[PDB]
């Protein structure tokens, strides 16, 4: 399929005649992406012309370029002159001064549905000005990213007022802003009062504790449209997790993606999480990375994942204090659960014995794991014959990450022999930062030519 030309450049030096050449194209383009191309403010006067005359330009992505405030005022000269849908200006050295320009813009284009301005020191005052544009009836914005924008608690009344005026909003990210509990509670009330069918709410590293988890719960229970909640890197603990599960377990809640990484959860949280896993058929993806769940916690989740209502497809439990002790429990799940497709369980001392046990479950006919991540799991060469047999036998396993394991030349050679076998349907074998001699470096190169449908990443 084709939908207009897609100009996409990243991490390059842009040269003026090439820039000249590329201009004629940009007049044709459906999307324009110039990511980290060391663009400066002077290039934006050109782009502003394109925005106005190109009836087909729908996406403009200029992240990681130092456009600065001056750049955005130039760039938007054309946007104040009418059909851009997506505008990304993440990490572009914008300050609060850009927000007046962006206020004008948001008030100008009903066509604009997505604005990404994360990683800019806009600050509370700046985003307050931005909200004034969001409040305009003309503004039909659907997605707003304000992560790492140096926002403080004082932003929330302005945002709430803007949300009330944004029934078209579907996605909101405020991650990595020091809001705190009082503010997040106020924000939750604002979202519940707003008519928007919010689909995604990201509040990672926002200063949230158990003190605002009842309020987040009320969002989950009042917004059936909410599919994606991220509150990782907030120290909510078992207490806050239990409060969140009141909303997760609410019959209105239709959560699909739940991100709870680095939330200071212990094994005790896995009681409540098990009840979610075995009750909420809509739940598809969960990250619990960097929580000290331990073997006992993992084992509770595994018992939950055997209930037929468990439709989880993706579980990340990297760095969760897991050992071989939990692997029989995990293997059991792979045996009977048909829905689980992705497991990340790296940075756990599973050892050779733990991983050999997982391979038992993997081989079961109704195991639908297609991607298994086992980086830094203390496995060595002794496990690789077992892994090899999995690779040639399990047709539906297409991705395996064994990075940061001391597999030794002997272990990797065993994996290679599996890759050569034609019954092997592996698509990406990932082997970062594994120390091998040059004879393996040469064998991988030779094997790239023998089986190009199997990518070996290092």
Partner 1 sequence: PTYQDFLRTHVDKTSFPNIAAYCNVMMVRRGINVHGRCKSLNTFVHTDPRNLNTINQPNRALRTTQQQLPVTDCKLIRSHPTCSYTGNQFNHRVRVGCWGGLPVHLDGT
| 260-289 CB burial, b ≥16 within 10 A, e <16 | bbbbbbbbbbbbbbbebbbbbeebbbbbbb
| 297 contacts 320 by C-beta, under 8 angstroms | yes
Between 14 and 249, CB nearer to partner 1: 14
Give the total of residues touching partner 1 (CB under 8 A): 39
Strands 314-316, 285-287: pairing is parallel
Please spell the DSSP secondary structure of 270-319, one letter per residue: HHHHHHHHHH-TT--EEE-TT-B-HHHHHHHHHHHTTSTT----EEE-TT
| 298 contacts 322 by C-beta, under 8 angstroms | yes
Composition of the chain by helix, strand, coil, percent to 5: 40, 15, 45
Among the listed residues 20, 435, 445, 448, the single contact to partner 1 using CB under 8 A: 435
Quick check: helix, strand or coil at residue 407?
coil
Q: Rg of the chain over CA atoms, in angstroms?
A: 25
Among the listed residues 376, 377, 384, 412, the single contact to partner 1 using CB under 8 A: 376
Q: Does residue number 289 form part of the binding site for partner 1 (CB under 8 A)?
A: yes
Helix 44-53 vs helix 68-75: crossing angle, to nearest 10: 20
Stretch of residues binding partner 1 (CB under 8 A), selected from 51-59, 71-79, 118-126, 128-136:
118-126
Q: Does residue number 442 form part of the binding site for partner 1 (CB under 8 A)?
A: no
| Smallest distance, partner 1 to C-beta of residue 94, A | 10
Between 100 and 228, CB nearer to partner 1: 228
Please, what's the largest Cα pairwise distance for the chain?
66
* Cα–Cα distances in angstroms (integers) from residue 290 to residues 54, 257, 293, 322, 416, in the given order: 47, 17, 9, 11, 32
Q: Does residue number 448 form part of the binding site for partner 1 (CB under 8 A)?
A: no
Among the listed residues 10, 25, 81, 182, the single contact to partner 1 using CB under 8 A: 10
Q: Does residue number 278 form part of the binding site for partner 1 (CB under 8 A)?
A: no
Q: Does residue number 61 form part of the binding site for partner 1 (CB under 8 A)?
A: no
Q: Does residue number 121 form part of the binding site for partner 1 (CB under 8 A)?
A: yes
| Smallest distance, partner 1 to C-beta of residue 63, A | 8
Please spell the DSSP secondary structure of 102-161, one letter per residue: HHHHHHH-TT--EEE--SSB-HHHHHHHHHHHHTSTT----EEE-TTS---GGGHHHHHH
Q: Does residue number 458 form part of the binding site for partner 1 (CB under 8 A)?
A: yes
Q: Does residue number 432 form part of the binding site for partner 1 (CB under 8 A)?
A: yes
| Smallest distance, partner 1 to C-beta of residue 54, A | 24
Q: Does residue number 321 form part of the binding site for partner 1 (CB under 8 A)?
A: no
Residues for the chain: how many in total? 458
Among the listed residues 109, 222, 287, 348, the single contact to partner 1 using CB under 8 A: 287
DSSP label at 266?
Answer: B
Among the listed residues 4, 5, 36, 279, the single contact to partner 1 using CB under 8 A: 36
Between 163 and 286, CB nearer to partner 1: 286
Q: Does residue number 181 form part of the binding site for partner 1 (CB under 8 A)?
A: no
| Smallest distance, partner 1 to C-beta of residue 368, A | 19
Tokens of 382: 């002794």
Q: Does residue number 64 form part of the binding site for partner 1 (CB under 8 A)?
A: yes
Stretch of residues binding partner 1 (CB under 8 A), selected from 96-104, 268-276, 340-348, 380-388:
340-348
Q: Does residue number 399 form part of the binding site for partner 1 (CB under 8 A)?
A: no
Strand partners, 342: 314, 371
Tokens of 167: 């029934």
Between 131 and 289, CB nearer to partner 1: 289
Interface of this chain with partner 1, residues 218 to 257, rule: CB under 8 A: 232-233
Interface of this chain with partner 1, residues 85 to 114, rule: CB under 8 A: 91
Stretch of residues binding partner 1 (CB under 8 A), selected from 43-51, 67-75, 101-109, 429-437:
429-437
Tell me how far apart the alpha carbons of residues 343 and 108 are, in angstroms, rounded to a whole number.
Answer: 45
To which residue do tokens 């050449």 refer?
Answer: 21
Between 277 and 373, CB nearer to partner 1: 373
Tell me how far apart the alpha carbons of residues 286 and 230 are, in angstroms, rounded to a whole number.
Answer: 10
Beta strands in 147-250 (DSSP E): 171-173, 200-202, 228-230
Chain centroid to CA 329: how far? Answer: 28
Tell me how far apart the alpha carbons of residues 54 and 43 are, in angstroms, rounded to a whole number.
Answer: 17
Stretch of residues binding partner 1 (CB under 8 A), selected from 16-24, 96-104, 341-349, 386-394:
341-349
Q: Does residue number 120 form part of the binding site for partner 1 (CB under 8 A)?
A: yes
Quick check: helix, strand or coil at residue 315?
strand
Between 33 and 414, CB nearer to partner 1: 33
Q: What residue ranges bind partner 1 (CB under 8 A)?
A: 10-11, 35-36, 64, 91, 119-121, 147-148, 176, 204-205, 232-233, 259, 261-262, 287, 289, 318, 344, 346-347, 373, 375-376, 401, 403-404, 432-433, 435, 437-438, 441, 457-458
């Amino acid at each position: 399929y084709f939908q207009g030309m897609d100009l996409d450049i990243q991490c390059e030096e842009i040269n003026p005649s090439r820039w000249a050449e590329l201009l004629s194209t940009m007049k044709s383009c459906s999307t324009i992406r110039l990511d980290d191309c060391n663009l400066s403010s002077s290039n934006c006067k050109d782009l502003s012309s394109i925005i106005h005359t190109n009836p087909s330009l729908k996406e403009l992505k200029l992240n990681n370029n130092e456009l600065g405030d001056a750049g955005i005022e130039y760039l938007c000269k054309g946007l104040l002159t009418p059909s851009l849908q997506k505008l990304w200006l993440q990490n572009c050295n914008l300050t609060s001064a850009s927000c007046e320009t962006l206020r004008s813009v948001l008030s100008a284009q009903p066509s604009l549905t997505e604005l990404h301005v994360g990683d800019n020191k806009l600050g509370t005052a700046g985003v307050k000005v931005l909200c004034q544009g969001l409040m305009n009836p003309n503004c039909k914005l659907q997605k707003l990213q304000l992560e790492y924008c140096e926002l403080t608690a004082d932003i929330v009344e302005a945002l709430n007022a803007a949300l009330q005026a944004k029934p078209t909003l579907k996605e909101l990210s405020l991650s990595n802003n020091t809001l705190g509990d009082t503010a997040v509670k106020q924000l939750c009330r604002g979202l519940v009062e707003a008519s928007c069918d919010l689909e995604l709410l990201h509040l990672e590293n926002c200063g949230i504790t158990s003190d605002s988890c009842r309020d987040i719960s009320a969002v989950l229970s009042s917004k059936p449209s909410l599919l994606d909640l991220a509150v990782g890197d907030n120290k909510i603990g078992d207490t806050g997790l239990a409060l969140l599960c009141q909303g997760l377990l609410h019959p209105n809640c239709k959560i699909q993606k739940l991100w709870l990484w680095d939330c200071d959860l212990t094994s005790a949280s896995c009681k409540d999480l098990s009840r979610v896993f075995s009750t909420k058929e809509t739940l598809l993806e969960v990250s619990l990375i960097d929580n000290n769940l331990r073997d006992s916690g993992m084992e509770m989740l595994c018992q939950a994942l055997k209930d037929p209502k468990a439709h989880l497809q993706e579980l990340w439990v990297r760095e969760c204090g897991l050992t071989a002790a939990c692997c029989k429990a995990v293997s059991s799940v792979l045996s009977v659960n048909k829905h689980l497709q992705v497991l990340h369980i790296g940075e756990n001392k599973l050892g050779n014995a733990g991983v050999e046990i997982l391979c038992e479950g993997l081989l079961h006919p109704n195991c639908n794991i297609h991607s298994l991540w086992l980086g830094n799991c203390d496995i060595t060469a002794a496990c690789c014959a077992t892994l090899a047999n999995v690779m040639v036998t399990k047709q539906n396993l297409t991705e395996l990450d064994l990075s940061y394991n001391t597999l030794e030349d002997e272990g990797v050679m065993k994996l290679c022999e599996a890759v050569r076998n034609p019954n092997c349907k592996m698509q990406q074998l990932i082997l970062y930062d594994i120390f091998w001699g040059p004879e393996v470096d040469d064998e991988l190169k030779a094997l790239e030519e023998a089986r190009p449908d199997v990518k070996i990443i290092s």
